[PDB]
């Protein structure tokens, strides 16, 4: 491997950028290090940092992906979203090119992942009722 | 998902050299190899060789290593995923046996076991 | 010609039927240690990638074309013949860091 | 199913309201969209939102329920908490009626769930010590 | 057991202090209960509380330990970190004495745990690709 750094594979293939996720998983929250200009403006930025982060953790939690960097689910890939082959995606276009093609259907997928999780712990609720 | 227009049909005589261009568009020129293939009157098709617009690396058949002059420029980026590049082609010891139609070809993928496979072809250039 | 990778010389077919083109050679260019790519090639014009890596089709390639590669020879089938199929087909053996080793060619007729 | 909405089953049975949890799991944190009246008062409300949310995630984490919408545990149901039948609860009273009857014992249960988890990863700690 | 309290085993053995983790897991975030001196200074402290807490949850998430109080991993114990016996640690020195001896190598270990998790969900990604 080569430590490309933060967003080092932004122009690389989705198969190469998918193996370096814990690099952008650290610097998404950074860390730790009173009334003036930047003082109030720094605290406003520190709050926004944890809000956007908890939204991505809350969304991951209600999908059953809480704690996963790569998470497999039940929702099948609808051909209307992207009728592209598996080899022309992971070894071709980048994650930036991918988000533009899925920008439309990305809201429908987020709802399919939620009920696919609620209708899984509810099934397991009956699976442990005996 | 872009075009690869070439030069015209320039006809010379044996012993000389011919320059063939290949102007790309509609795709990131530095992300895919540029293969060169010809179909001469005497054989079928023959793979000449490809070159990497990113690594600048060459790999060509031994039947054309001591004849082919193969170079590329540097893309003029249009957008984030679009650019405009150029691939050049020249031969050395020319004969009437090399008479045929020549085209460039953009590589297949950006990774894997078929990274350079000629996918998107040009239009054709008739030689001597 | 000096193609070490032979094919099927020529073949004929009819509308609504399926064809098959062979592609084999010696142990130096075939087969289980090399990928096989098939190319539709009108006479001296713009080619087209039909199949790459033995059996994988290119983007937009119709589900009619199929592929198979035994230990001895690779086959290109053309299921359900349509009239616009008359052309010449070529195969190529390659690896990840090599070049295309093309074949002899096979003219396919759909006259029906 | 019928998309009743946020808190749509507040007056419905505990068995019907338990199958629509990811609806109130989203809007508990909402999201994203500098010195005046509402400005300071908005930032005070944005901080309180993530604090009450992380308390419910911290409590869920120390119970082994981190990531669960329905979570099964080891603590047996004490009859002193509610000596009611299973059918007279899930197909009768609502979650609002349930919280009033359990408001007393709800603190004892929260402690029983904590040590029931610590005496589970400690048992599994010995289970993987060989 | 004896409810020693918050940090009650700070001077006790690492084997005794390791069985009372949910005690310091609660009071790390405490909880809930506008322009003056302490007012601005309280909100500055309330934000810092959730930031240091989410860093320890983000670090636990990218290690595969999200939700664990005791978490077992794959990284083997390098003798250069501490060439001490298992009995002279868990039944001798305290967690305070332990952190001083590992203060150096503690950054190398945090990187070994990250890639040990990414090269585990990536292996499981191929394990479910069939
Ligand atoms: C930026 O974007 C560019 C363009 O997309 C990326 O460049 C492409 O990268 C991919 C993957 O990294 C390349 O595909 C591989 O191609 C090699 C072929 O290289 C071999 O042969 C070359 C010619 O004979 C030779 O030059 C190579 O030797 C080394 O020396 C050169 C010196 O210039 C050096 O630059 C090289 O890097 C080499 O190290 C080499 O021997 C092929 O072997 C690969 O197949 C292997 O790997 C795949 C998995 O990747 C595996 O499935 C196979 O089985 C096999 O094991 C692979 O196909 C592609 O050729 C590059 N160029 C293009 C597409 O034009 C670049 O990586 C991006 N960088 C970043 C940082 O994003
Ligand atoms: C694909 O999505 C459409 C809506 O965009 C839906 O009507 C259809 O049933 C879906 N098909 C599959 C196979 O998921
Ligand atoms: C998304 O919707 C817009 C609506 O204007 C449309 O133009 C665009 O093509 C859609 N995206 C895709 C990938 O089709
Ligand atoms: C029920 O709770 C009481 C305390 O309220 C306790 O003394 C008793 O042991 C508990 N019984 C069971 C069966 O849990
Ligand atoms: C809870 O405690 C109060 C103490 O005043 C008592 O009145 C009430 O009945 C208790 N709750 C239940 C359900 O018994
Ligand atoms: C221990 O760590 C050193 C670096 O401090 C490293 O070089 C060595 O390979 C490691 N050995 C083991 C067994 O982990
Ligand atoms: C950590 O590094 C310092 C560097 O000054 C060194 O003095 C100290 O001994 C090191 N810690 C250990 C446990 O060796």
């Amino acid at each position: 491997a080569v430590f490309l750094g933060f967003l080092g594979a932004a122009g690389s293939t989705m198969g190469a950028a998918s193996m370096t996720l814990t690099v952008q998983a650290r610097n998404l929250l950074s860390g730790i290090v009173k009334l003036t200009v930047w003082g109030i403006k720094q605290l406003q930025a520190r709050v926004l940092a944890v809000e956007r982060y908890l939204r991505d953790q809350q969304l991951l939690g209600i999908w059953g992906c809480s704690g996963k960097l790569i998470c497999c689910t039940n929702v099948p890939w609808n051909s209307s979203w992207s009728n592209r082959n598996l080899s022309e995606i992971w070894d071709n276009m980048t994650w930036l090119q991918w988000d533009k093609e899925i920008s439309n259907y990305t809201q429908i997928i987020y709802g399919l992942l939620e009920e696919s999780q609620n209708q899984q712990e509810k099934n397991e609720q009956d699976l442990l009722a005996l | 998902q872009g075009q690869l227009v070439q030069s015209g049909a320039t006809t010379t005589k044996p012993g000389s050299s011919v320059k063939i261009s290949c102007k790309t568009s509609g795709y990131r020129f530095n992300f895919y190899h540029i293969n060169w293939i010809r179909q001469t009157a005497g054989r079928g098709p023959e793979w000449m060789g490809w070159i990497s617009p990113y690594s600048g690396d060459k790999n060509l058949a031994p039947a054309f290593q001591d004849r082919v002059n193969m170079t590329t420029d540097t893309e003029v980026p249009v957008t984030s995923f679009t650019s405009t590049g150029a691939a050049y082609m020249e031969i050395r010891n020319l004969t009437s046996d090399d008479t045929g139609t020549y085209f460039c070809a953009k590589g297949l993928l950006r990774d894997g076991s078929s990274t350079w496979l000629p996918y998107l072809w040009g239009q054709g250039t008739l030689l001597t | 010609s000096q193609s070490v990778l032979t094919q099927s010389a020529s073949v004929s077919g009819s509308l609504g039927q399926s064809v098959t083109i062979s592609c084999t050679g010696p142990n130096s260019v075939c087969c289980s240690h090399k990928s096989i790519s098939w190319y539709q090639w009108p006479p001296g014009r713009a080619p087209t990638l039909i199949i790459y890596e033995d059996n994988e089709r290119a983007p937009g390639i119709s589900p009619r074309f199929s592929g198979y590669k035994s230990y001895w020879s690779a086959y290109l089938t053309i299921s359900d013949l349509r009239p616009e199929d008359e052309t010449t087909y070529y195969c190529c053996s390659y690896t990840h860091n090599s070049g295309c080793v093309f074949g002899t060619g096979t003219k396919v007729s759909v006259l029906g």
Side-chain angles (χ1 to χ4, degrees), chain A, chain B, chain C:
Chain A
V2 42
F3 209 152
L4 234 299
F6 186 79
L7 299 182
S12 304
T13 63
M14 291 176 57
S18 58
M19 303 177 301
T20 58
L21 305 189
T22 74
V23 187
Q24 291 91 244
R26 294 192 302 261
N27 307 118
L28 193 62
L29 209 50
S30 277
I32 320 301
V33 178
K34 78 280 237 300
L35 201 12
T36 77
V37 269
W38 320 103
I40 56 167
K41 144 139 51 194
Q42 167 189 4
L43 190 64
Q44 192 79 42
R46 272 148 41 90
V47 174
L48 176 57
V50 316
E51 287 183 321
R52 275 170 35 85
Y53 168 79
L54 285 188
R55 170 179 48 82
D56 301 325
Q57 294 291 337
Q58 173 85 305
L59 262 188
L60 250 43
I62 65 180
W63 297 350
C65 300
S66 54
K68 282 293 201 307
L69 294 136
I70 299 182
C71 181
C72 296
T73 54
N74 298 118
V75 172
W77 189 251
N78 195 322
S79 295
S80 300
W81 301 339
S82 180
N83 190 81
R84 292 182 174 265
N85 198 266
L86 198 68
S87 184
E88 76 183 67
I89 291 178
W90 294 106
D91 289 333
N92 206 45
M93 46 195 301
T94 85
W95 274 101
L96 282 166
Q97 327 194 239
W98 178 249
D99 187 72
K100 183 178 182 179
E101 188 171 331
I102 318 295
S103 300
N104 302 56
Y105 319 94
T106 193
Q107 264 293 336
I108 308 175
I109 306 177
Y110 290 175
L112 269 53
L113 263 342
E114 292 172 36
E115 46 106 326
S116 177
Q117 181 64 29
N118 218 12
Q119 196 59 217
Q120 174 178 341
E121 300 172 1
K122 202 87 216 69
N123 303 145
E124 194 196 334
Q125 209 290 312
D126 302 358
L127 253 303
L128 272 56
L130 36 128
Chain B
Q1 299 181 178
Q3 273 58 45
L4 284 84
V5 292
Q6 315 177 224
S7 61
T10 64
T11 54
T12 63
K13 246 38 244 171
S16 60
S17 299
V18 182
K19 182 84 170 185
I20 292 184
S21 62
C22 181
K23 300 159 297 180
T24 73
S25 58
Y27 78 100
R28 274 297 302 266
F29 168 70
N30 290 147
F31 285 176
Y32 303 91
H33 299 265
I34 290 294
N35 296 261
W36 288 98
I37 316 289
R38 44 92 114 172
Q39 189 177 19
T40 44
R43 289 182 170 180
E46 179 172 35
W47 174 87
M48 299 190 276
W50 51 261
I51 186 178
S52 183
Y54 166 80
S55 175
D57 202 318
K58 306 153 174 291
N59 192 266
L60 71 183
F64 280 138
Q65 57 161 324
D66 303 333
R67 290 207 240 175
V68 165
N69 203 343
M70 190 169 53
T71 54
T72 61
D73 288 354
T74 43
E75 62 175 63
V76 186
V78 190
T79 64
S80 299
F81 322 104
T82 317
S83 71
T84 41
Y88 298 142
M89 224 299 186
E90 269 195 9
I91 29 76
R92 186 180 306 172
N93 210 37
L94 192 273
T95 60
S96 295
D97 207 337
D98 296 8
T99 293
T101 300
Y102 291 65
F103 7 73
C104 42
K106 142 201 174 81
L108 180 57
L109 298 173
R110 295 185 58 186
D111 199 8
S113 301
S114 296
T115 329
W116 52 262
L117 201 61
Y119 174 78
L120 235 174
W121 298 77
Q123 60 201 20
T125 48
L126 302 143
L127 206 56
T128 170
Chain C
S1 182
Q2 207 170 2
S3 179
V4 206
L5 218 68
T6 62
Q7 294 197 217
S8 173
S10 184
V11 78
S12 180
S14 56
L15 280 73
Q17 299 299 329
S18 55
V19 220
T20 300
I21 304 177
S22 178
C23 175
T24 171
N27 195 262
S28 301
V29 273
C30 168
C31 272
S32 75
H33 28 72
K34 268 146 170 288
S35 296
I36 303 302
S37 65
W38 288 92
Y39 283 94
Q40 165 185 332
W41 211 319
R45 276 187 53 255
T48 299
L49 180 71
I50 291 186
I51 287 181
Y52 67 96
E53 299 175 16
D54 307 335
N55 49 87
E56 297 290 342
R57 292 132 48 184
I61 287 299
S62 186
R64 299 144 53 199
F65 309 90
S66 301
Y68 194 90
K69 187 193 68 179
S70 300
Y71 218 136
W72 301 277
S73 45
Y75 309 142
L76 175 76
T77 78
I78 311 177
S79 177
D80 182 59
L81 268 181
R82 300 184 190 177
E84 64 279 358
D85 273 329
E86 285 211 23
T87 174
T88 315
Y89 300 81
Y90 305 87
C91 54
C92 140
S93 75
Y94 63 95
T95 49
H96 44 77
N97 59 335
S98 62
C100 249
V101 190
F102 281 96
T104 58
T106 298
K107 292 82 190 173
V108 178
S109 301
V110 81
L111 303 172

